[PDB]
Amino acid sequence: QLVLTQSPSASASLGASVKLTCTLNSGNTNFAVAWHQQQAGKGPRYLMTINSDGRQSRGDGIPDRFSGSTSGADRYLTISSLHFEDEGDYYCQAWTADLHVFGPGTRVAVVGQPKAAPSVTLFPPSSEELQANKATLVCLISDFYPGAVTVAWKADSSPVKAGVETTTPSKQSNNKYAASSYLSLTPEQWKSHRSYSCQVTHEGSTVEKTVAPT
Amino acid sequence: EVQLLESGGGLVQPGGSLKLSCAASGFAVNNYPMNWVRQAPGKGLEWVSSIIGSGSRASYADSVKGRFTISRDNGKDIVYLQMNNLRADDTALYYCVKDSSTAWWDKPAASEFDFWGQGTMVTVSSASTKGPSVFPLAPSSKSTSGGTAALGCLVKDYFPEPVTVSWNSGALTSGVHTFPAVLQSSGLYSLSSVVTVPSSSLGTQTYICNVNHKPSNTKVDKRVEPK
């Protein structure tokens, strides 16, 4: 029976407030919920527990800009002053001594923050891989914001789509983003073209890195 | 100093079995009921199982009932999760988590989770392991002394995730960036790790990358030579 629903994704300027909702279903309106924060690429941590009557139990170590509020069957986690530390997926948890139930998950991300351009690195096939009758071109894109990029590949001047494996961007240590693209091809193809190129488009800016057989 | 150290994850076959272990320390463990929470790679949290401190009562989710078995040993403060008849939907990172509230001995109990482990990764797939190949990504021929040159290591075709990469046996952490692996259309993973170094340091300092793929017992130390 017990099922709780959550709010769609959240978006706020840096340092502005944000407020996430966790809604209990019928017959369980008096239940307590707990909030858990999974920052990008890390394990979840316990944030706080709010219950119907108004009590808040927080976890040691969390910043004090997190608070919780109650309205009937509606439990809110409010972040006044939204930081980059606070970005990530927030889940709410309910329990009944016979089972546990988690939320769909709500994502919190800043909006309106300055635009950061990517740095691109292109690696041609190693001679070891060439001797192994194989050839992989490694395009490494890092330190960009926001995490939305599009990659293309080129043999000489003509575009190439066969052999491309591009990852989805993910947050890194400095709250910016990174991705990579791998172009697989035969060593004969590598040696037959003048140059191969990795083209990276981000927020309008299209840059390109180019390597050639030596 | 609360710590939940989980182990026993790996690559298992659809229909196989696997026994997870959680070493719990830093608190009177049997005062609290223990739990298991799993997460698919690109999906949300899902409760799996729970066991009260005495170990005589337990609770499961309908998607794992009768198939999994949570256990507990209080002389060693280790929580176990025995999974039988596994299948694709069970591949996940499994967390071992702790209830915040204690309760009466041997009686039912549950509360909010107050602490999470880092998880242990179980991958249920009929595909088998493979140790990756390793190649040096040499500094480009356009590396003038007095600048930055990028070098690295390419670990190609490995299953399953992940591979750990260090440089010069751990003595080089400055400017190292290891990338999340791409999942190729062949089903195998590939990543590369890159460090950017002073250009004139090439030829004076040798750079060696140390890659480790525990699922296949493959340690590889490759030195990246300028060309």
Numbering used by the authors:
A (entry chain L): 1 to 214
B (entry chain H): 1 to 227
Original authors' sentences:
Towards this goal, we have analyzed two cooperating antibodies, DH475 and DH272, which exerted pressure on the HIV population in an infected donor, called CH848, to evolve in such a way that it became sensitive to the V3-glycan supersite DH270 bnAb lineage. Cooperating antibody lineages exert evolutionary pressure on HIV, forcing the virus to develop escape mutations in such a way that makes it more sensitive to a bnAb lineage. Donor CH848 developed the DH270 bnAb lineage, which targets this epitope, and DH270 lineage development relied on cooperating lineages DH272 and DH475. DH272 and DH475 were able to neutralize autologous virions isolated during the first year of infection, but then lost potency due to mutations in Env.
To determine how DH475 binds Env, we determined a 2.90Å crystal structure of DH475 with a Man9 glycan, and it revealed a heavy chain paratope. This paratope was dominated by contacts from a 27FAVNN31 motif on CDRH1, a 102TAWW105 motif on CDRH3, and residues N74, G75, and D77 on FW3. The S54 backbone on CDRH2 also participates in this interaction. On CDRH1, N30 and N31 both form hydrogen bonds with mannose moieties of the pentasaccharide core of Man9, and N30 forms an additional hydrogen bond with mannose B on the Man9 D3 arm. W104 on CDRH3 forms a hydrophobic stacking interaction with the core N-acetyl glucosamine, while D77 on FW3 forms two hydrogen bonds with mannose C on the Man9 D1 arm. While the D1 and D3 arms of Man9 interact with the DH475 heavy chain, the D2 arm is distal to the binding interface. Wild-type DH475 bound to the CH848 TF gp120 core with a KD of 4.0µM, and mutation of the paratope residues eliminated binding affinity (KD>50µM), confirming the physiological relevance of the DH475-Man9 crystal structure. Superposition onto five of the published structures identified a binding mode in which DH475 may bind an open Env gp120 but clashes with the V1V2 loops of a closed gp120, consistent with co-elution data showing DH475 formed a stable complex with an open Env trimer or gp120 monomer, but not a closed Env trimer. We observed reduced binding to DH475 by the mutant (KD=14µM compared to 4µM for the wild-type core). DH475 binds a glycan-dependent epitope on an open or shed Env that has already bound CD4 and/or a co-receptor and its binding site spans the V3 loop and the base of the V4 loop.
